Write a protein that binds this ligand. Structure first.
Ligand SMILES: O=P(O)(O)O[C@H]1[C@H](OP(=O)(O)O)[C@@H](OP(=O)(O)O)[C@H](OP(=O)(O)O)[C@@H](OP(=O)(O)O)[C@H]1OP(=O)(O)O
Ligand SMILES: [Zn+2]
Length: 378
């Protein structure tokens, strides 16, 4: 149960070598960012990060993102303008940080011929852009992701974080529908567990809907845990529970990344979990520190990771991409929600995912109130 589970796809690095390297690189970068772990912000329960490799040489690995955090937003603090982070579990934050890197990389491709050489993207013959060959991303988490991977209840079942609650709880037998006004009045906000979000990324990709208008689906090649690694539980949680998925749109797949623990596993530590979450993306001068309860920084400023900020980045790319090179038509992007819906193939993939969970007996995905996404840029 402690042996690595091979990827069912490509695998270009020795598993245990890759696992130890990515875990070392993420920890090292986090130390660098926290003044050799001396910052108040070095205090963490869970550390996560993303490492990129190019080709076969593990020496070339580059840390893309580093994050911490174990909490989510208080329901009263939901933003209807995209200004608040909903979910500050480290692994979730590390993906959003990766998104910024992806926007930057598209901008390098689009800027000019010289910046273009540095980009990890190439033109796709199918339209838009795709990764250069053998560019891979690897997810590191210092412990097993919450929900199905950690809890071992029913094997593979969907589970939610619940506001101000520890751990996760099963999804109900009848599909739960959240409402803006119900949450404001005191219904506790539910957020899908990290196990469930990563399984989601193993179908719809890590890039999200908006980025899929520009690029082909991108998947993690590896998921590396720094503690509580159990191959069989993790393989079920990360993909196998939804092997029943069908009718995926073009380029989507049920991704089955390498799964591995590390040679020197961490221990469970005592202490109250920090209420904050650190994030950093390669290229950033410093970490950003977010209060998990409000989803904003300590001064009430919006995160560089918030919906609004990501949409700002997306809009900037949208103005640079010739219409005929988009993967999905979107002439005059306005409301955030509607722009996401323009990613038609991604939405179809998401629907196949939701159906897979339901049909497998694992419950129904619990979505946010729609009002979160009903905003435009000024
Ligand atoms: O990083 P996450 O916290 O997991 O955020 C995601 C993400 O939303 P944003 O990128 O707008 O913050 C998803 O968007 P996609 O790129 O996958 O489209 C969205 O899914 P929808 O597209 O269905 O809105 C999902 O929202 P939901 O909770 O309704 O599943 C939401 O997760 P959180 O709401 O938990 O932040
Ligand atoms: Zn989690």
């Amino acid at each position: 149960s402690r042996q690595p589970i091979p990827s069912e796809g490509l695998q270009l690095h020795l598993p245990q070598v890759l696992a130890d390297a990515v875990s070392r690189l993420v920890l090292g970068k986090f130390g660098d960012l926290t003044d050799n772990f001396s910052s108040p912000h070095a205090r963490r329960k869970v550390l996560a990060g993303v490492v990129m490799t190019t080709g076969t040489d593990v020496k070339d690995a580059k840390v893309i993102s580093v994050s911490t955090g174990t909490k989510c937003i208080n329901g009263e603090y939901m933003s209807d303008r995209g200004l608040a982070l909903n979910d500050c579990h480290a692994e979730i934050i590390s993906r959003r940080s990766l998104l910024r890197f992806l926007y930057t990389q598209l901008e390098l491709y689009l800027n000019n011929k010289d910046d273009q050489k540095r980009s990890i993207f190439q033109k796709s013959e199918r339209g838009g852009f795709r990764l250069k060959e053998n560019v891979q991303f690897h997810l590191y988490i210092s412990t097993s992701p919450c929900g199905d991977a950690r809890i071992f209840k029913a094997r593979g079942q969907l589970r939610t974080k619940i506001e101000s609650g520890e751990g996760t709880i099963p999804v109900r037998s009848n599909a739960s529908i959240q409402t803006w006004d119900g949450v404001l009045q005191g219904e506790r906000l539910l957020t899908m567990s990290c196990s469930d979000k990563i399984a989601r990324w193993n179908v719809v990709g890590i890039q999200g809907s908006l980025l899929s208008i520009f690029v082909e689906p991108i998947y993690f090649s590896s998921i590396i845990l720094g503690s509580l690694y159990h191959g069989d539980h993790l393989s079920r949680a990360m993909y196998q529970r939804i092997s029943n998925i069908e009718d995926l749109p073009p380029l989507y797949t049920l991704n089955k990344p390498l799964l591995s623990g590390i040679s020197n596993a961490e221990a469970r530590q005592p202490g109250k979990a920090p209420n904050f979450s650190v994030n950093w993306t390669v290229g950033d001068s410093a970490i950003e520190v977010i209060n998990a309860t409000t989803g904003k920084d300590e001064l009430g400023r919006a995160s560089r990771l918030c919906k609004h900020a990501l949409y700002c980045r997306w809009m900037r790319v949208h103005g640079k991409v010739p219409s005929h090179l988009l993967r999905s038509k979107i002439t005059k992007p306005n409301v955030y929600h509607e722009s996401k819906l323009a990613a038609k193939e991604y939405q179809a993939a998401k629907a196949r995912l939701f159906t897979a969970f339901i049909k497998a007996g694992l419950g129904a995905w619990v979505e946010k109130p729609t009002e979160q996404d009903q905003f435009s840029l000024t």
